[PDB]
A paper describes a structure:
The AhbA/B complex is a heterodimer formed from two similar protein subunits that share a near identical fold. Both proteins consist of an N-terminal and a C-terminal domain joined by a linking region.
Native crystals diffracted to 2.23 Å and the structure was solved using 3 wavelength SeMet MAD data. The initial structure confirmed the formation of a heterodimer of AhbA and AhbB with two heterodimers in the asymmetric unit. The full sequence of AhbB was correctly traced in the structure except for the histidine tag, which was disordered. The majority of AhbA was also identified with only the first 20 and last 10 amino acids in disordered regions. The AhbA linker contains a single turn helix (α4) that is not observed in AhbB. This AhbA α4-helix is stabilized by the N-terminal methionine of AhbB. The effect of the different linkers between the two domains that form the heterodimer AhbA/B is that the central cavity formed between the N- and C-terminal domains is opened up to form the substrate-binding cavity (see below for more details on substrate binding). Superimposing the entire AhbA/B dimer onto AsnC using AhbB as a template demonstrates that the N-terminal domain of AhbA is angled towards that of AhbB.
Numbering used by the authors:
A (entry chain A): 22 to 166
B (entry chain B): 1 to 159
């Protein structure tokens, strides 16, 4: 629930918030609005949680980072220890208990394929549980919208 | 990160990965916190936006036109000759958001084509599984139903 100027503003700032010294003045000139009103409107939409975040979103691969999907057959007696060693890694962003023999599925991001492998080997060493390192070699569909 | 960026550049990037300073001149505020000029801030952000290192420089909004809910992680058996064909065909579906090919040398894990399925009711997700079976050569599969979300975090590239 907002006005057409907020819809036009959000249509611009989603593609690109202006990379200029006075960006709200640049938005004001494009929208036919006073510089301060555009700041007021952005603050309001942020406060109402319509704007989640205003900043940079990176493309991991272009920063020299590699990503993988990891899987393990975790027995009930090793569960709490394994889950804790996995979650203690900052490179792990997603961890899930899944309905299969391979019941622990997690994402691991790091600067290289060698560092990711050393992290996985380090986990196996502490828990006694082997891990499948499954990087993607081909991408057909990706969600960001 | 030290190999691609100067300490000052990394300082700008540590802030922008969170939020832009809340003012009329955010690039001047970035410049003073990092030990750079405003023009240098703009050149760094412009360079990474141009190269694609910054996929998006702006606002993250609540969804777009998305409601809820049901997710379905399904892994399929695939031979090398089927890969591109099955990949491209499975990805043409509206209810699928992720299609990955992840080779596996593990004897007890023969599934390598991954489709992330969406929609509503459990049966609608099972329906897209039937849609993939009629529209592709993919047959044998494993449904990896989420039982518990153990960690959901965002990656911090600049520490």
């Amino acid at each position: 629930d907002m006005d057409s100027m907020d819809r036009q503003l959000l249509d611009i700032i989603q593609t690109g918030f202006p990379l200029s010294p006075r960006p709200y003045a640049e938005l004001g000139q494009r929208l036919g609005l006073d510089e301060q009103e555009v700041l007021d409107r952005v603050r309001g939409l942020k406060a109402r949680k319509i704007i989640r975040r205003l900043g940079a979103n990176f493309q991991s691969a272009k920063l020299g980072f590699v990503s993988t999907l990891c899987a393990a057959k975790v027995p009930q007696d090793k569960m709490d220890a394994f889950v804790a060693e996995v979650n203690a890694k900052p490179g792990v962003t997603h961890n899930y208990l899944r309905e299969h023999d391979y019941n622990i599925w997690f994402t691991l991001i790091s600067p290289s394929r060698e560092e990711t492998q050393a992290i996985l080997d380090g986990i196996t060493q502490a828990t006694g549980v082997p891990i499948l390192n499954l990087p993607a070699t081909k991408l057909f569909k990706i969600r960001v919208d | 990160m030290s190999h691609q960026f100067s300490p000052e550049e990394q300082a700008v990037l540590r802030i922008v990965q969170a939020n832009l300073p809340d003012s009329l001149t955010p690039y001047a505020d970035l410049a003073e916190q990092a030990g750079m000029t405003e023009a240098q801030v703009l050149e760094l952000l412009g360079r990474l936006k141009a190269s694609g290192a910054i996929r998006r420089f702006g606002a993250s909004i609540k969804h777009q036109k998305t409601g809820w809910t049901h997710n379905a992680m399904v892994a399929w058996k695939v031979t090398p000759d089927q890969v591109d064909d099955c990949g491209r065909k499975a990805a043409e579906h509206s209810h699928i958001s992720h299609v990955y090919y992840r080779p596996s040398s593990a004897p007890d894990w023969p599934y390598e084509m991954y489709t992330m399925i969406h929609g509503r009711s459990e049966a609608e997700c099972l329906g897209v599984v039937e849609d993939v079976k009629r529209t592709t050569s993919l047959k044998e599969h494993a449904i990896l139903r989420s039982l518990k979300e153990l960690k959901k975090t965002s990656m911090t590239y600049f520490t």
